[PDB]
Amino acid sequence: NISDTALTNELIHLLGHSRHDWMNKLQLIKGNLSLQKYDRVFEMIEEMVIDAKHESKLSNLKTPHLAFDFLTFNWKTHYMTLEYEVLGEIKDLSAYDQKLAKLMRKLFHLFDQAVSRESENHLTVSLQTDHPDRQLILYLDFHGAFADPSAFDDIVDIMRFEITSHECLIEIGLD
Amino acid sequence: SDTALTNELIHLLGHSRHDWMNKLQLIKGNLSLQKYDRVFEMIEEMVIDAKHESKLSNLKTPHLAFDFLTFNWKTHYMTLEYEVLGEIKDLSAYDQKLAKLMRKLFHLFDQAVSRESENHLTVSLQTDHPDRQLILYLDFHGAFADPSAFDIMRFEITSHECLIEIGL
């Protein structure tokens, strides 16, 4: 049974953040509408829909905490900007929400211990449901710069790991 | 809490997301049919509508605010719109009494409006009257089924309007 005292207070806090984003988005739209540039303005809307279609998919993968930690990510960690895609048809990964979530928390932690607070550090997480013989593959594509590049060099089957001076490719596989 | 709260928060953030999606589809539709003026008018309103949502969020009337925000995301037979007329003022005490009343009035409304009509209600909280500290204004437009289901400083139900003024 959910505490409506918690739910109320947190729905207002979170919608507050969703609203600042939606304002910061309309302003971009209006800004380039007011400088006559419809080609860019439709591009912007089409892109904004894209990203909301992935948010919808991450919501409908029945992975409650992974979705949560991912929507609220950018509202609460200034470390790097998350961005995510769900590739393949939606599936019920309810049974993997606790595993995937804790894993992503662990990876974010070791990325925060390692990314450089001076460059535009971005992380894209693309979840794959579409694989012939693995339940999910998570692809992490980082762009940025590191401080402690060493904090990973340590490291579910981690299928691939490439560190360059300004990129990182990790691919986790599941079953 | 943990999973419980979280999946509820995530389903509600998804309602908000549909709303902003629809607002974007509308704007693109008016760019498409080259009607630029209607788009700046639209953007202005979404700016306004977000201002009243902040206003509600910061009146320290947490439960009223929640009900008002989720109204359209729940099963009702009329749309809501709201406005907070005046300066943000700590309606901290009134919160639970206001929320109670607005729920009793929303139920009266769901029993009275024509389920087969596009009913709409606008509620303007006047946190600014000189005389009494708060007036809830209801401008309903739609149609009725048992119109009979209906301090009140006005009440005027006609066939496609119902004006109720409430002061505290």
mmCIF file of N, CA and C in Angstrom, chain B residues 44-128:
data_model
loop_
_atom_site.group_PDB
_atom_site.id
_atom_site.type_symbol
_atom_site.label_atom_id
_atom_site.label_comp_id
_atom_site.label_asym_id
_atom_site.label_seq_id
_atom_site.Cartn_x
_atom_site.Cartn_y
_atom_site.Cartn_z
ATOM 1 N N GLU B 44 2.359 30.373 -25.763
ATOM 2 C CA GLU B 44 2.059 31.317 -24.678
ATOM 3 C C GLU B 44 1.188 30.704 -23.596
ATOM 4 N N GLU B 45 0.189 29.948 -24.051
ATOM 5 C CA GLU B 45 -0.719 29.316 -23.128
ATOM 6 C C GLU B 45 -0.016 28.224 -22.349
ATOM 7 N N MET B 46 0.819 27.387 -22.975
ATOM 8 C CA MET B 46 1.501 26.312 -22.271
ATOM 9 C C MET B 46 2.444 26.875 -21.213
ATOM 10 N N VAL B 47 2.889 28.111 -21.456
ATOM 11 C CA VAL B 47 3.730 28.863 -20.527
ATOM 12 C C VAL B 47 2.911 29.311 -19.348
ATOM 13 N N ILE B 48 1.679 29.726 -19.657
ATOM 14 C CA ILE B 48 0.745 30.243 -18.659
ATOM 15 C C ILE B 48 0.304 29.116 -17.765
ATOM 16 N N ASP B 49 -0.077 28.017 -18.422
ATOM 17 C CA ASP B 49 -0.623 26.835 -17.766
ATOM 18 C C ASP B 49 0.425 26.214 -16.839
ATOM 19 N N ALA B 50 1.704 26.253 -17.254
ATOM 20 C CA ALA B 50 2.792 25.849 -16.387
ATOM 21 C C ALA B 50 2.931 26.836 -15.228
ATOM 22 N N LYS B 51 2.738 28.171 -15.389
ATOM 23 C CA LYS B 51 2.815 29.127 -14.276
ATOM 24 C C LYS B 51 1.784 28.798 -13.190
ATOM 25 N N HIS B 52 0.571 28.434 -13.581
ATOM 26 C CA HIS B 52 -0.452 28.117 -12.595
ATOM 27 C C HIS B 52 -0.131 26.808 -11.901
ATOM 28 N N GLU B 53 0.542 25.885 -12.583
ATOM 29 C CA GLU B 53 0.966 24.624 -11.997
ATOM 30 C C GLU B 53 2.082 24.847 -10.980
ATOM 31 N N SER B 54 2.930 25.860 -11.166
ATOM 32 C CA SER B 54 3.957 26.147 -10.169
ATOM 33 C C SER B 54 3.283 26.729 -8.955
ATOM 34 N N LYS B 55 2.411 27.700 -9.260
ATOM 35 C CA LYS B 55 1.644 28.403 -8.268
ATOM 36 C C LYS B 55 0.950 27.437 -7.334
ATOM 37 N N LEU B 56 0.354 26.405 -7.912
ATOM 38 C CA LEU B 56 -0.359 25.430 -7.115
ATOM 39 C C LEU B 56 0.605 24.604 -6.283
ATOM 40 N N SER B 57 1.728 24.297 -6.924
ATOM 41 C CA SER B 57 2.760 23.505 -6.304
ATOM 42 C C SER B 57 3.427 24.161 -5.113
ATOM 43 N N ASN B 58 3.463 25.489 -5.160
ATOM 44 C CA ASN B 58 4.072 26.273 -4.096
ATOM 45 C C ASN B 58 3.075 27.012 -3.180
ATOM 46 N N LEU B 59 1.757 26.754 -3.223
ATOM 47 C CA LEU B 59 0.818 27.339 -2.263
ATOM 48 C C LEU B 59 0.895 26.593 -0.932
ATOM 49 N N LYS B 60 1.752 25.569 -0.798
ATOM 50 C CA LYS B 60 1.850 24.708 0.380
ATOM 51 C C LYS B 60 0.529 24.017 0.703
ATOM 52 N N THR B 61 -0.189 23.740 -0.384
ATOM 53 C CA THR B 61 -1.432 23.012 -0.332
ATOM 54 C C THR B 61 -1.172 21.774 -1.186
ATOM 55 N N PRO B 62 -0.481 20.865 -0.513
ATOM 56 C CA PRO B 62 -0.004 19.634 -1.107
ATOM 57 C C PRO B 62 -1.068 18.679 -1.598
ATOM 58 N N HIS B 63 -2.115 18.436 -0.815
ATOM 59 C CA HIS B 63 -3.075 17.430 -1.240
ATOM 60 C C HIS B 63 -3.982 17.970 -2.328
ATOM 61 N N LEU B 64 -4.460 19.235 -2.247
ATOM 62 C CA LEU B 64 -5.241 19.884 -3.308
ATOM 63 C C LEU B 64 -4.490 19.876 -4.620
ATOM 64 N N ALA B 65 -3.203 20.226 -4.505
ATOM 65 C CA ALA B 65 -2.331 20.294 -5.668
ATOM 66 C C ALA B 65 -2.232 18.933 -6.362
ATOM 67 N N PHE B 66 -1.920 17.874 -5.615
ATOM 68 C CA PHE B 66 -1.913 16.528 -6.166
ATOM 69 C C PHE B 66 -3.184 16.161 -6.927
ATOM 70 N N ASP B 67 -4.357 16.317 -6.307
ATOM 71 C CA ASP B 67 -5.663 16.028 -6.902
ATOM 72 C C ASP B 67 -5.908 16.785 -8.194
ATOM 73 N N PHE B 68 -5.507 18.052 -8.188
ATOM 74 C CA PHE B 68 -5.640 18.910 -9.331
ATOM 75 C C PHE B 68 -4.752 18.523 -10.497
ATOM 76 N N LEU B 69 -3.558 18.023 -10.166
ATOM 77 C CA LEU B 69 -2.570 17.638 -11.163
ATOM 78 C C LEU B 69 -2.882 16.300 -11.870
ATOM 79 N N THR B 70 -3.433 15.376 -11.102
ATOM 80 C CA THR B 70 -3.770 14.052 -11.579
ATOM 81 C C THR B 70 -5.178 13.883 -12.088
ATOM 82 N N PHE B 71 -6.029 14.898 -11.908
ATOM 83 C CA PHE B 71 -7.444 14.829 -12.241
ATOM 84 C C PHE B 71 -7.772 14.150 -13.547
ATOM 85 N N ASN B 72 -7.090 14.603 -14.587
ATOM 86 C CA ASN B 72 -7.312 14.193 -15.974
ATOM 87 C C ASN B 72 -6.710 12.853 -16.405
ATOM 88 N N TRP B 73 -5.867 12.393 -15.491
ATOM 89 C CA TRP B 73 -5.168 11.140 -15.590
ATOM 90 C C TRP B 73 -5.958 10.035 -14.865
ATOM 91 N N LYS B 74 -7.111 10.394 -14.277
ATOM 92 C CA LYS B 74 -8.000 9.475 -13.586
ATOM 93 C C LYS B 74 -9.391 9.491 -14.238
ATOM 94 N N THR B 75 -10.270 8.577 -13.841
ATOM 95 C CA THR B 75 -11.533 8.404 -14.532
ATOM 96 C C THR B 75 -12.670 9.308 -14.066
ATOM 97 N N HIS B 76 -12.797 10.370 -14.859
ATOM 98 C CA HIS B 76 -13.787 11.410 -14.638
ATOM 99 C C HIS B 76 -14.496 11.732 -15.939
ATOM 100 N N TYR B 77 -15.639 12.394 -15.805
ATOM 101 C CA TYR B 77 -16.485 12.685 -16.935
ATOM 102 C C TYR B 77 -16.548 14.172 -17.284
ATOM 103 N N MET B 78 -15.400 14.809 -17.056
ATOM 104 C CA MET B 78 -15.200 16.219 -17.296
ATOM 105 C C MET B 78 -13.702 16.481 -17.156
ATOM 106 N N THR B 79 -13.173 17.391 -17.971
ATOM 107 C CA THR B 79 -11.783 17.821 -17.889
ATOM 108 C C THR B 79 -11.640 18.913 -16.840
ATOM 109 N N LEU B 80 -10.456 19.058 -16.257
ATOM 110 C CA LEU B 80 -10.182 20.144 -15.355
ATOM 111 C C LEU B 80 -9.150 21.076 -15.963
ATOM 112 N N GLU B 81 -9.205 22.295 -15.493
ATOM 113 C CA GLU B 81 -8.234 23.310 -15.817
ATOM 114 C C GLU B 81 -8.196 24.111 -14.531
ATOM 115 N N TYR B 82 -7.079 24.731 -14.143
ATOM 116 C CA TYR B 82 -7.089 25.562 -12.960
ATOM 117 C C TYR B 82 -6.184 26.763 -13.123
ATOM 118 N N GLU B 83 -6.327 27.677 -12.172
ATOM 119 C CA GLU B 83 -5.676 28.969 -12.232
ATOM 120 C C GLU B 83 -5.539 29.388 -10.797
ATOM 121 N N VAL B 84 -4.450 30.080 -10.568
ATOM 122 C CA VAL B 84 -4.229 30.551 -9.231
ATOM 123 C C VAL B 84 -4.022 32.004 -9.443
ATOM 124 N N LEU B 85 -5.109 32.675 -9.086
ATOM 125 C CA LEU B 85 -5.235 34.119 -9.165
ATOM 126 C C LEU B 85 -4.814 34.803 -7.872
ATOM 127 N N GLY B 86 -3.693 35.509 -8.012
ATOM 128 C CA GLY B 86 -3.133 36.273 -6.906
ATOM 129 C C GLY B 86 -1.735 35.789 -6.560
ATOM 130 N N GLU B 87 -1.157 36.337 -5.486
ATOM 131 C CA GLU B 87 0.194 36.008 -5.037
ATOM 132 C C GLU B 87 0.233 34.637 -4.365
ATOM 133 N N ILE B 88 1.299 33.820 -4.536
ATOM 134 C CA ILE B 88 1.411 32.544 -3.826
ATOM 135 C C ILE B 88 1.448 32.860 -2.315
ATOM 136 N N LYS B 89 0.518 32.225 -1.602
ATOM 137 C CA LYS B 89 0.261 32.500 -0.195
ATOM 138 C C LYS B 89 0.030 31.205 0.567
ATOM 139 N N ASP B 90 0.706 30.962 1.702
ATOM 140 C CA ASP B 90 0.582 29.701 2.420
ATOM 141 C C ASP B 90 -0.769 29.343 3.011
ATOM 142 N N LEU B 91 -1.475 28.604 2.144
ATOM 143 C CA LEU B 91 -2.789 28.068 2.424
ATOM 144 C C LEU B 91 -2.651 26.734 3.159
ATOM 145 N N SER B 92 -1.602 26.646 3.996
ATOM 146 C CA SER B 92 -1.204 25.457 4.710
ATOM 147 C C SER B 92 -2.315 24.778 5.497
ATOM 148 N N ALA B 93 -3.166 25.550 6.190
ATOM 149 C CA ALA B 93 -4.250 25.020 7.011
ATOM 150 C C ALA B 93 -5.495 24.549 6.270
ATOM 151 N N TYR B 94 -5.729 25.340 5.229
ATOM 152 C CA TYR B 94 -6.893 25.167 4.392
ATOM 153 C C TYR B 94 -6.750 23.960 3.492
ATOM 154 N N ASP B 95 -5.526 23.444 3.347
ATOM 155 C CA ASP B 95 -5.207 22.404 2.380
ATOM 156 C C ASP B 95 -6.145 21.215 2.290
ATOM 157 N N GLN B 96 -6.257 20.589 3.440
ATOM 158 C CA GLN B 96 -7.048 19.384 3.662
ATOM 159 C C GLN B 96 -8.569 19.605 3.648
ATOM 160 N N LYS B 97 -9.013 20.839 3.950
ATOM 161 C CA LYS B 97 -10.433 21.205 3.981
ATOM 162 C C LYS B 97 -10.895 21.545 2.568
ATOM 163 N N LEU B 98 -10.043 22.268 1.821
ATOM 164 C CA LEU B 98 -10.181 22.577 0.400
ATOM 165 C C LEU B 98 -10.199 21.318 -0.440
ATOM 166 N N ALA B 99 -9.201 20.449 -0.254
ATOM 167 C CA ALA B 99 -9.103 19.179 -0.964
ATOM 168 C C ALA B 99 -10.324 18.308 -0.742
ATOM 169 N N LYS B 100 -10.812 18.332 0.510
ATOM 170 C CA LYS B 100 -12.002 17.569 0.860
ATOM 171 C C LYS B 100 -13.207 18.053 0.058
ATOM 172 N N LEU B 101 -13.387 19.377 0.044
ATOM 173 C CA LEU B 101 -14.488 20.033 -0.634
ATOM 174 C C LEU B 101 -14.423 19.850 -2.134
ATOM 175 N N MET B 102 -13.253 20.027 -2.728
ATOM 176 C CA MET B 102 -13.063 19.848 -4.142
ATOM 177 C C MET B 102 -13.337 18.411 -4.544
ATOM 178 N N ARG B 103 -13.115 17.452 -3.642
ATOM 179 C CA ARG B 103 -13.435 16.077 -3.997
ATOM 180 C C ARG B 103 -14.924 15.880 -3.933
ATOM 181 N N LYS B 104 -15.627 16.497 -2.965
ATOM 182 C CA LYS B 104 -17.075 16.339 -2.852
ATOM 183 C C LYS B 104 -17.769 16.995 -4.032
ATOM 184 N N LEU B 105 -17.276 18.159 -4.447
ATOM 185 C CA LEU B 105 -17.758 18.829 -5.636
ATOM 186 C C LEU B 105 -17.369 18.071 -6.904
ATOM 187 N N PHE B 106 -16.177 17.473 -7.049
ATOM 188 C CA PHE B 106 -15.867 16.711 -8.261
ATOM 189 C C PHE B 106 -16.751 15.484 -8.433
ATOM 190 N N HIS B 107 -17.173 14.843 -7.332
ATOM 191 C CA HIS B 107 -18.076 13.692 -7.352
ATOM 192 C C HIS B 107 -19.504 14.090 -7.705
ATOM 193 N N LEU B 108 -19.981 15.204 -7.125
ATOM 194 C CA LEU B 108 -21.266 15.798 -7.469
ATOM 195 C C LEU B 108 -21.221 16.062 -8.963
ATOM 196 N N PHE B 109 -20.135 16.700 -9.428
ATOM 197 C CA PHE B 109 -20.013 16.942 -10.844
ATOM 198 C C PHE B 109 -20.036 15.662 -11.654
ATOM 199 N N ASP B 110 -19.318 14.585 -11.294
ATOM 200 C CA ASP B 110 -19.316 13.346 -12.081
ATOM 201 C C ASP B 110 -20.669 12.644 -12.134
ATOM 202 N N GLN B 111 -21.540 12.912 -11.147
ATOM 203 C CA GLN B 111 -22.894 12.372 -11.111
ATOM 204 C C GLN B 111 -23.908 13.204 -11.902
ATOM 205 N N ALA B 112 -23.569 14.486 -12.108
ATOM 206 C CA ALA B 112 -24.402 15.455 -12.812
ATOM 207 C C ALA B 112 -24.070 15.693 -14.280
ATOM 208 N N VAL B 113 -22.802 15.799 -14.693
ATOM 209 C CA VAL B 113 -22.482 16.013 -16.110
ATOM 210 C C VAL B 113 -22.891 14.873 -17.059
ATOM 211 N N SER B 114 -23.241 15.196 -18.309
ATOM 212 C CA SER B 114 -23.563 14.195 -19.313
ATOM 213 C C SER B 114 -22.296 13.425 -19.675
ATOM 214 N N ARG B 115 -22.285 12.126 -19.331
ATOM 215 C CA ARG B 115 -21.165 11.246 -19.648
ATOM 216 C C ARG B 115 -20.856 11.240 -21.143
ATOM 217 N N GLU B 116 -21.864 11.554 -21.961
ATOM 218 C CA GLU B 116 -21.730 11.607 -23.408
ATOM 219 C C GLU B 116 -21.496 12.992 -24.030
ATOM 220 N N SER B 117 -20.897 13.917 -23.240
ATOM 221 C CA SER B 117 -20.638 15.323 -23.564
ATOM 222 C C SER B 117 -19.242 15.806 -23.243
ATOM 223 N N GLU B 118 -18.641 16.730 -23.995
ATOM 224 C CA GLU B 118 -17.321 17.179 -23.591
ATOM 225 C C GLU B 118 -17.303 18.327 -22.579
ATOM 226 N N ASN B 119 -17.494 17.879 -21.341
ATOM 227 C CA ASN B 119 -17.570 18.732 -20.156
ATOM 228 C C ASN B 119 -16.257 19.314 -19.698
ATOM 229 N N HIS B 120 -16.208 20.539 -19.207
ATOM 230 C CA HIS B 120 -14.958 21.185 -18.799
ATOM 231 C C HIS B 120 -15.262 22.072 -17.606
ATOM 232 N N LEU B 121 -14.288 22.090 -16.696
ATOM 233 C CA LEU B 121 -14.340 22.866 -15.464
ATOM 234 C C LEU B 121 -13.005 23.563 -15.260
ATOM 235 N N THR B 122 -13.178 24.822 -14.899
ATOM 236 C CA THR B 122 -12.053 25.697 -14.682
ATOM 237 C C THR B 122 -12.254 26.112 -13.236
ATOM 238 N N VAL B 123 -11.172 26.112 -12.453
ATOM 239 C CA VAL B 123 -11.211 26.450 -11.043
ATOM 240 C C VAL B 123 -10.141 27.500 -10.867
ATOM 241 N N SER B 124 -10.549 28.654 -10.344
ATOM 242 C CA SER B 124 -9.630 29.748 -10.090
ATOM 243 C C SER B 124 -9.599 30.045 -8.602
ATOM 244 N N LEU B 125 -8.441 29.766 -7.988
ATOM 245 C CA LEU B 125 -8.231 30.041 -6.577
ATOM 246 C C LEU B 125 -7.764 31.463 -6.476
ATOM 247 N N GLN B 126 -8.610 32.293 -5.853
ATOM 248 C CA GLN B 126 -8.295 33.691 -5.642
ATOM 249 C C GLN B 126 -7.752 33.835 -4.244
ATOM 250 N N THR B 127 -6.428 33.879 -4.259
ATOM 251 C CA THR B 127 -5.609 34.112 -3.069
ATOM 252 C C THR B 127 -5.361 35.637 -3.014
ATOM 253 N N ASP B 128 -6.366 36.513 -3.170
ATOM 254 C CA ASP B 128 -6.096 37.951 -3.264
ATOM 255 C C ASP B 128 -7.234 38.881 -2.880
#
